[PDB]
Amino acid sequence: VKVVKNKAYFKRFQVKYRRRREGKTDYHARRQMVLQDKTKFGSPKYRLVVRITNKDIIAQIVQAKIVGDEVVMAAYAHELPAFGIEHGLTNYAAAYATGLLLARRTLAKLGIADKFQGAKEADGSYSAVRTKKDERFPFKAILDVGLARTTTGARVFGVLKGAVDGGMAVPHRPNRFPGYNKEKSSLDAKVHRDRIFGKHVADYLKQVKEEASSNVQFSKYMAAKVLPESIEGMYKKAHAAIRADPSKSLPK
Amino acid sequence: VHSYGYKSGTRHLFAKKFRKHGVPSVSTILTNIKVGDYVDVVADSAVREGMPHKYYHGRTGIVWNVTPRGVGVIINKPVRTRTLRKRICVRFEHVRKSRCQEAFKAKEHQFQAYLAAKKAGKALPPLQKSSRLGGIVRPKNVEVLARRVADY
Amino acid sequence: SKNHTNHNQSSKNHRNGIKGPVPLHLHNSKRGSWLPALVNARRVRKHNQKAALKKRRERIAAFAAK
Amino acid sequence: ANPMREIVVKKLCINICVGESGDRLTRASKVLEQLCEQTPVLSRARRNEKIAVHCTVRGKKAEELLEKGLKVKEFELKSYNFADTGSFGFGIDEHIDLGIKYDPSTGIYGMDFYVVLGRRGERVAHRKRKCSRVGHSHHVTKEEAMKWFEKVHDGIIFQ
RNA sequence: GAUACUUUAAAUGUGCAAACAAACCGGCCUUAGCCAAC
RNA sequence: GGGCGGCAUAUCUGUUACACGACAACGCAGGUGUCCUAAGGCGAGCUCAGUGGGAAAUCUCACGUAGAACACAAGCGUAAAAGCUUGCUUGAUUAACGAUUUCCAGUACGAAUCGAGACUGCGAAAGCAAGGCCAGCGAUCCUUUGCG
RNA sequence: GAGUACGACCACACUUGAGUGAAAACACCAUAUCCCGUCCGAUUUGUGAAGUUAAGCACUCAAGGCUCAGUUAGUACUGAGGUCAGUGAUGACUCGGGAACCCUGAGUGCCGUACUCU
Ligand SMILES: [Mg+2]
Ligand SMILES: [Mg+2]
């Protein structure tokens, strides 16, 4: 049995890109995302990058440059305690809140905060975004999800809806939202609203308490004595808190 | 005589360098090309859309037209007793910005800086001297240059 | 019967010289260019012609005054 | 040592290489379903004809079926059965012998059992994002598979 | 390889430029062009 | 020499060919007049050829820079793909006489490149697609069909 | 002095074998009523936070590779010249240009935007 990785194997070997070897970036998709019309002589174009870790969610607005990407503005789901959310980070409701927080900070920085108020009312409805590609036009960015799989109900789309309701232009169809039915080809705003406000979390929490009454899941809720029938209200209050103080961050 | 196609005899011309395969990069994508710029036309063998004919593979010209994904370039070509100006259309993967005028632009910039300093009254740098003048040479080592028995 | 050679051809081509290319600023037509930019440039040129006519009239009036 | 190195049964695989496309293969497909409670999957040769049936059971069901097969095997196999990279297997010749009530519509089949063993943390080589290779200290040696064979469903290597 | 195909790589070549319809520095006019906007 | 034979008579790849381009011989080694409603278009998932250790061709683990595949000759090119499996589709339609390359007299034909408009396909989106990259084809007059 | 997210150049960054890892983070890890997907909650999708640096990762340390110099060497080859020498193959000379493998010496990533910890 001759060895494979012999002397002649290394001389003819070409290494892949650094981030391809680390398995972080899909360069084929990145090229199509950063590409722009050459007749638009380098006018600004923006990505909404969403990355979900094990214990946090990350969302930033990025413009690409030769020297390296620059971040216009970033928001993290881990600072939502400063607005009134705890014990329930990295879920669909926190995704919605993260998106809305990012949009509010971005419009506030770019100075168009009063215009494009977004949707002060919360609903899992669909409304096609207004774009020149089709009155002052709304600030626009395209969604970047990375290597994540784009299945119906995934949290990347909840993050997206957060910004859309915050008042951003992100082109999209409502085909990957939780309430969508593929065979009938329609969306259920009631179901989407339920997932936005976190009814399923409350149902699971009630079930686990009722079952564990006899003789590790949801341990922090059970320990801190969080009660059902308040989760929707807590999220609804957090939304107003953000729209009042978009920058109130974690202390010190 | 027997076979003369569009890509005939391009075995070594349209090939990638050793251990340098792959596809264009974001630096190529993010490059801005305007009408009136000098560019080099170099065929990228991994794209295969909008590739120029092999005659234009090493030439330099002027951009006359920009489209959403293409560039139009003017390139001189001698035919019999005259030089024609041919207009070729390519994808943006197959061009590069030319550095054929760097020295001239640098000369103009240095002239402007010199004019600014002369008007300001600042002291000018000391001008370089010639290397072909005479002088006294103080040697450190002297040797004997010779052809010896051991040499052969 | 079918001979081919290039023997005297360069000598023939250099008697009246290889002529240089036409300068870039002559024969600089835009036909076949990307359409939207062309359409905008035409409107700008029409406005410029109107301005040139007005400027000539003003110059003539000023000279008549003095 | 560290609790993270506890050897666990990753999965169990059941195979029937019938090699025939007729009704016997389909009856084997029925008995596999009635045995494992999960739908089996067919396998075609490299052609265009199905010639094998197999599964992949994971969990307490896998542990239970492994114990059941080891009962027939009398907890004794051969050392060469163990393989480098940590795994082993065997076969059963009379399917009803595994407590399956005989049905005349089918007959008897020569089932094959295979097992996979490893620690926890091997996800880093089947992940989609940042897929990498496990270190060698974390791997499982053939001697270690043999040693785990004892004191957990103890049996005789009978080398 | 077989038992000349090739990483490396000349000499001789070959394309472009080297301030007077060109290019450099600051106002201003116009566009039913790009950009969230200018 | 001519006859016999053959096609070097349209046409592609590697060589001949001499590091831009061009360059001949009944020079050398090979191809073409077809085939495909998918073997065309797009999105997603996956990794191939092969080697080693196991289990009464198939099942399993590790390695595997492409050593396989891409209708057919050859050369280039390609690895979260341009290969394989799969879902939906008909951009293989129409396209105001736009411009261009190859041959080249800077004529045509065949093939190809960059576009503007309509109507669409696939996709969450940016995008991609007016056949299968590059060989696979044809004047006047006459016949015949569509259109106003 | 570190970490994470997005990155430009794409081996001085790769392959193999070991040791160390403050706090933060990243990650293994627990689970399957709901959205969603499989023969299989393996992969993927949702909801979590008991445990762990064992692995991934980062740093450091020894070999194949890779990168930059030196030698090989004014050698091989080559533009120009002769009523040059030789039967010829070829060779030297005159005015110019000038390598490669092998061998050997050194090192083993670097530069941006945003937010965090000691
Ligand atoms: Mg179109
Ligand atoms: Mg007729």
How far is B104 from A221, CA to CA, in rounded Å? 72
Residue type, A24: K
d(CA A3, CA C13): 63
Evaluate whether A50 touches A159 at the Cβ level (below 8 Å): yes
- Tell me if B86 sits within 8 A of B78, measured CB to CB: no
Using CB atoms within 10 Å of the CB of residue A52, give its burial: 0 to 12 exposed, 13 to 18 middle, 19+ buried: buried
| Contact between residue A101 and residue A246 where contact means Cβ atoms under 8 Å apart | yes
Name which of D51, A128, D12, A40 is nearest B32 in CA terms: A40
Element (H, E) at D54: strand D50-54
Whether A202 and A128 have beta carbons less than 8 Å apart is answered as no
| CB proximity D128–strand G (7 Å threshold) | yes
> Distance from CA of residue A227 to its chain's centroid?
27
Interacting residues of D20 by C-beta distance below 8 A, sequence separation 6+: D51
Question: Among C19, C22, C24, whose Cβ lies nearest the Cβ of B62?
Answer: C24
D100-106 long-range contacts, CB within 8 A, separation 24+: D100/D31, D100/D34, D100/D35, D105/D27, D106/D24, D106/D27, D106/D28, D106/D30, D106/D31
Please enumerate in sequence order all residues whose Cβ is within 8 A of that of A129, keeping only pairs 6 or more positions apart, or say none.
A138, A140, A164, A169, A170, A171, A172
Question: Number of H helices and number of E strands within chain D?
Answer: 3, 5
Q: How many residues does chain C have?
A: 66
Residue A111 phi, psi (nearest 5) = 80, 20
End-to-end CA distance of chain A: 63
Distance from CA of A18 to the nearest CA of D (A): 12
Q: Residue B6 and residue B78: Cα distance in Å, rounded?
A: 20
Closest to B6 measured CA to CA, from B75, B53, B47: B53
Nearest to A125 by CA among A200, A187, A47: A187
- Tell me which amino acid residue D7 is: I
A168, B137, D25, D31, D50 from D42: Cα distances, Å: 50, 94, 9, 13, 6
Structure tokens at A69: 């990407």
Neighbouring subunits of B (3+ Cβ pairs under 8 A)? A, C
Other CB atoms within 10 Å distance of the CB of residue B74? 16
Paired tokens of B3: 């076979």
Resolution in A: 2.5
Give the helix/strand (H/E) hosting C54: helix C35-65
**Amino acid sitting at position A173:** R
Strand order in the sheet with B95-97: B83-91, B70-78, B60-66, B38-41, B95-97
Cα D58–Cα D148–Cα D96 angle in degrees, nearest 5: 50
Ligand index nearest the alpha carbon of residue B68:
1
Contacts of D86 (CB under 8 A, 6+ apart): D116, D117, D118, D139, D140, D141, D142, D144, D145
Rounded to 5 degrees, what are φ and ψ at A140?
-125, 150
Query: What are φ and ψ of residue A26, in 5° steps?
Result: -100, 95
H helices present in chain A, as ranges:
7-11, 18-21, 27-34, 92-110, 155-166, 189-197, 199-212, 219-224, 231-244
Q: List phi, psi (to 5°) of C30.
A: -105, 5
Rounded-to-integer distance, Cα D149 and Cα B111, Å? 86
Separation in Å, CA of A31 to nearest CA in chain B: 6
- D98/D73 Cα distance (integer angstroms): 11
CB pairs under 8 A between A and B: 37
Q: What is the CA B64 to C1' F18 distance in angstroms?
A: 37
* Angle (deg, nearest 10), helices A92-110 and A189-197: 90
Q: Quick check: A215 and A176 in contact, CB under 8 A?
A: no
The closest of B85, B93, B36 to B63, measured between CA atoms, is: B36
Q: Which helix (H) or strand (E) holds D115?
A: strand D111-118
A113-133 burial code (b ≥16 CB/10 A, e <16)? eeebebeeebebbbeeeeeee
Experimental method, per PDB record: cryo-EM
Asked whether A89 and A77 are in contact (CB, 8 A), the reply is yes
Task: Give Cα D105 distance to the centre of its chain.
Answer: 26
Q: How far apart are the first and last CA of chain C?
A: 85
| C45: phi then psi, degrees, rounded to nearest 5 | -65, -35
CB-hemisphere CA count at 13 Å for A87? Answer: 17
Indicate yes or no: CB of C18 within 8 angstroms of CB of B83.
yes
Distance CA C62, CA C59 (A): 5
Q: How far apart are CA A221 and CA A208, in angstroms?
A: 11
Q: How far is CA B25 from the centre of its chain?
A: 20
Q: How far is the CA of B50 from the C1' of G11 (A)?
A: 33
For every residue of A10-54, DSSP letters joined together read: HHT-----HHHHTT---HHHHHHHH---TTS-S----EEEEEE-S
Q: Rounded to whole angstroms, what are the CA distances from B72 to A146, B12, B75, B92, C25? A: 35, 26, 10, 10, 17
Measured distance CA(C10)–CA(C4) in Å, rounded: 15
* Torsion-angle region of A146 (φ positive above 0: left; ψ -120 to 50: alpha; else: beta): left
**Residue D36 host element (H or E):** helix D23-36
Tokens 């170099």 locate to B42
Tokens representing B110? 């240095």
Q: Count each helix (H run) and each strand (E run) in chain B, helices first.
A: 2, 5
Decide: helix, strand or coil at residue D144: helix
Tokens of D132: 């990498």
- Within a 13 Å sphere around the CA of D59, how many CA atoms are in the beta-carbon half? 4
- B81–C18: do the CB atoms touch at under 8 Å? yes
Q: Which two tokens stand for residue A133?
A: 């590609």
What does the alpha-carbon distance between residue A200 and residue A197 come to, in Å, rounded to a whole number?
A: 9
DSSP one-letter string for B40-109: EE---TTT-SSPPPGGGTT-EEEEEEE-SSEEEEEEEEE-SSSEEEEEEEEEGGGEEE--TTHHHHHHHH
Work out whether the CA dihedral B74, B78, B79, B83 comes out positive or negative: positive
Which residues contact residue A242 at a Cβ distance below 8 angstroms, ignoring those fewer than 6 apart?
A: A83, A97, A100, A101, A104
CA distance A245 to B35: 48
Distance (Å, whole) CA D155 – CA D146:
10
Distance CA A92, CA A157 (A): 9
Compute the distance between CA of residue B7 and CA of residue B104 in angstroms, rounded to an integer: 37
Tell me how far CA of residue B142 lies from CA of A130, B145, B149, B151, in angstroms.
Answer: 86, 10, 21, 20
- How far CA D118 is from CA of A206, B25, D6, in Å, comes to 37, 41, 9
Measuring alpha carbon to C1', the residue closest to nucleotide F46 is D128
Backbone φ, ψ for residue A211 (5° rounding): -70, -45
Residues 53-82/B with CB within 7 Å of nucleic chain F are: 53-55, 57-58, 67-70, 72, 77, 79-80
Name the nearest CA neighbour of A176 among A143, A203, A205, A208.
A143
Nearest to D113 by CA among D49, D51, D64, D60: D64
DSSP character at residue A236? H
Asked if the Cβ of residue A178 lies within 7 A of any atom of strand G, the reply is yes
d(CA A125, CA A103) in angstroms, rounded, equals 18
Q: CA-to-CA distance for A106 and A127, rounded, in angstroms?
A: 21
| Strand E-contacting residues in A 22-51, CB cut-off 7 angstroms | 40-41, 43-44, 46
* Cβ(A94)–Cβ(A57) below 8 Å: yes
Pick from D78, D45, D60: which is nearest to D149 by CA?
Answer: D78
Q: Is C41 in CB contact (< 8 Å) with chain A?
A: no
CB distance D124 to D145 below 8 Å: no
Q: Is A189 helix (H, G, I), strand (E, B) or coil?
A: helix
Give the SS3 label for residue B19: coil
Give yes or no for a contact between D7 and D144, defined as CB atoms under 8 angstroms apart: yes
B84 contacts: CB under 8 Å, gap ≥ 6:
B76, B77, B78, C21
Residue C3 CB contacts under 8 Å (≥ 6 apart), including other chains: none
D129 in contact with A, Cβ within 8 Å: yes
* Sign of the dihedral defined by the CA atoms of residues A97, A100, A106, A111, in that order: negative
Q: Ligand 2 centre and the CA of A213: distance in Å?
A: 99
Residue B132 burial (CB < 10 Å; 0-12/13-18/19+)? Answer: exposed
> Any idea what DSSP says for residue A167?
T
The residue among A91, A94, A101 whose CA lies nearest residue A60 is A101
Classify D121 in phi/psi space as left (phi over 0), alpha (psi -120 to 50) or beta.
left
3-state helix, strand, coil in chain A (%, to 5): 40, 10, 50
d(CA D97, CA D83): 27
Pairing of strands D8-16, B95-97: unpaired
